Write a sequence for this structure.
């Protein structure tokens, strides 16, 4: 944990750089190819995380976002207010740093 | 070797779920709060990789995207065509899976 100095002298780094430049040129609206003039700084860090893959049915509750006690709030009962959705969430957790990132989320109606 | 089973009956999972739902709620255009009705499938996987952090100066070349010798040819010496950019790329690599993904990418022109 914690980025250490690295350089273009290393395989992984040169490959990462060429990949990065390739993606940059791929995403740009420029008709011209851009290329690396110089690497001003390079660092590398081994990281680990835990992916949680959750398939979850969500229900619409009767509570608005502006109010308390949402975690046990009743689900809508009335015909046109009821909304349900089946969702797939991928959460990338890094317990060492106390963070979570939502890597993927798609939802389809019930 | 794939993701292993997990369940809501687990602390990491509940936290990841709460995070996912929270992110789902803040991103939606619904005035009502949504919450989990049922987790239908829960899996988890520990993963490792290497982050490469590269601060790179790119210069606009006179070669088009549609050209041979695609990364190595003249830089624009034309007064209003010339462009240099200082970019910060974060590449997440999984060497034992031979993959790379561009997680972050930002540039500030010169």
């Amino acid at each position: 944990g914690g980025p250490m100095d690295a350089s273009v002298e290393e395989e992984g780094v040169r490959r990462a750089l060429d990949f990065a430049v390739g993606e940059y040129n791929k995403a740009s609206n420029d008709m011209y190819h851009s290329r690396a003039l110089q690497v001003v700084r390079a660092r590398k860090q081994i990281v680990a995380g835990v992916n949680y893959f959750l398939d979850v049915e969500l229900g619409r509750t009767t509570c608005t976002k502006t109010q308390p006690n949402l975690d046990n709030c009743p689900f809508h009962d009335q015909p046109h207010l009821k909304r349900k959705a089946f969702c797939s969430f991928q959460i990338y957790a890094v317990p060492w740093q106390g963070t979570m990132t939502l890597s993927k989320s798609t939802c389809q109606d019930a």
